[PDB]
Structure 1
Amino acid sequence: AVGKNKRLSKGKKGQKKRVVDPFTRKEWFDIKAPSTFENRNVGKTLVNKSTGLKSASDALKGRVVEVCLADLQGSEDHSFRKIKLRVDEVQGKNLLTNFHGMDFTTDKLRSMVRKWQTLIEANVTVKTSDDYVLRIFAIAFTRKQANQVKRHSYAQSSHIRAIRKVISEILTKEVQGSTLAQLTSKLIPEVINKEIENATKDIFPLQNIHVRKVKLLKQPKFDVGALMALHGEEKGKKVT
């Protein structure tokens, strides 16, 4: 309310004059994705100022951007998936980014959950060979067969616990054998849920198997050389 009958409070005693000129003193920086993805160049972010090169460096090192894999890969069939990246190194209006985490969208999760089946959730923690302590959540629904006349398709608790055991072992084995870049390359084309289904085709027939969530928990010592390598030197112009 900015009405004349809005009763004045302590509030607006001493203001400030809008002279900061903020989007003239601020500066645009383009970010870039790791080389594992197809279309790396995505968007531009805003740095507060340039008097503090320390300020630019620290803000861009703290940046945690989020995109969706459909727009990142050109195939709009990855609409539900979504990743989070975090920027860690800068070089001249261009930023090098690395993987930070993953999620679905809540509309996809709500559309997955149905009313005549059981949900199974596996919740594992691991550390890859790149020493990224990580946590992976997966879900799987108990579908019905091609001959099913029963309404529901519920699984017994023994089958649920057995499938949790199999999925936990699968996730731990593959993401311990892999590295973080290799993990992203496994995580893009949905191969891990395919492996889970191919293994648990004999316990109980499932559907909608998905690695629901990836969560980084620790980060190792820095390696700008590894960053430059997984991403893919520059001289001046002799100002006088």
Structure 2
Amino acid sequence: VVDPFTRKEWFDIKAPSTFENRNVGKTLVNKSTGLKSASDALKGRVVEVCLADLQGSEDHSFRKIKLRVDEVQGKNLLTNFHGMDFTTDKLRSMVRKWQTLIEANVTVKTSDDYVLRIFAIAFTRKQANQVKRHSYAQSSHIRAIRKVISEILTKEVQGSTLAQLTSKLIPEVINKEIENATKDIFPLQNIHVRKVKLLKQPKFDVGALMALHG
């Protein structure tokens, strides 16, 4: 019988400035009171949003990104990168029978003192004037392309600190890098990352964090 709709308070999240337009919603958290209020104790609320309307795009329901809140100030709390993922629509649209499926996964230590895991998904297709039904591979080409993909995806990282790595990711440069890196086997192919996730964020880094403020 508390009726906490009047008790709670409105906050606005704020995405960092390694992005486009960064005002990305609001939250009803708790009452900002005395006696150890939780407004200055949450520090970890994570939000799932779409890169498309983050940038103003209008035709990408996939590649959702998630962000954790780091600090609070002025009833307007700034976030930071936590990870990214794809939607199950596009993945299970891409997947079908009479073709194969390539997957790779690296656990890489970047320039700044973070480690994070990155995935890489791929499929196969058929050249023009084709007769074959299925177009499967030879199971050694698979190991080769897995090797070169893992090499490229640990080459981009350890170098390309997370803040600019996101900015290079959101235009999807790595996919069209692979497409023309292994053009010898396939001039065009449908590659995606499909997953990134952090493990061992070491320290708050208030300095660079407030440098990338928005």
TM-score scaled by structure 2?
0.94
Give the drift of 1:167: 0.3
Q: Secondary structure at the match of 2:16?
A: coil
**Contact 1:29/1:95, CA 8 A, preserved across alignment:** yes
The whole-number CA distance in structure 1 between the counterparts of 2:69 and 2:175 is 29
Q: Structure 1 or 2: larger helix share?
A: 1
**Contact 2:15/2:80, CA 8 A, preserved across alignment:** yes
Moved over 6 A (4+): none
Q: Which has the higher contact order (CA 8 A, sep 6+)?
A: 2
Q: 1:54 to 1:143 in 2, by over 3 A?
A: farther
The structure that has the greater radius of gyration is 1
RMSD across aligned C-alpha pairs, in angstroms?
Answer: 1.5
Give the drift of 1:49: 1.7
Report Cα offsets for 1:151-185 as digits up to 9, x if no partner.
11111110000000000000000011110111100
Report Cα offsets for 1:105-125 as digits up to 9, x if no partner.
001111010212111001111
Give the drift of 1:60: 3.3
Using the TM superposition, name which of 147-156 and 118-127 deviates more.
Answer: 147-156
Percent of aligned positions that are identical: 100
Q: 1:153 to 1:230 in 2, by over 3 A?
A: same
Q: 1:53 to 1:40 in 2, by over 3 A?
A: farther
Unaligned runs of 5+ in 2: none
Residues 142-161 of structure 1 aligned to structure 2 (within 5 Å): 142-161=124-143
The whole-number CA distance in structure 2 between the counterparts of 1:72 and 1:53 is 37
Using the TM superposition, name which of 109-118 and 203-212 deviates more.
Answer: 203-212
Q: Secondary structure at the match of 1:118?
A: coil
The whole-number CA distance in structure 2 between the counterparts of 1:58 and 1:168 is 41
Give the drift of 1:59: 4.6
**Paired positions, count:** 213
TM-score scaled by structure 1?
0.84
Q: Secondary structure at the match of 1:171?
A: helix
**Contact 1:127/1:133, CA 8 A, preserved across alignment:** yes
Counterpart check, 1:170 vs 2:152: yes
Give the drift of 1:21: 2.0
Q: 1:58 to 1:153 in 2, by over 3 A?
A: farther
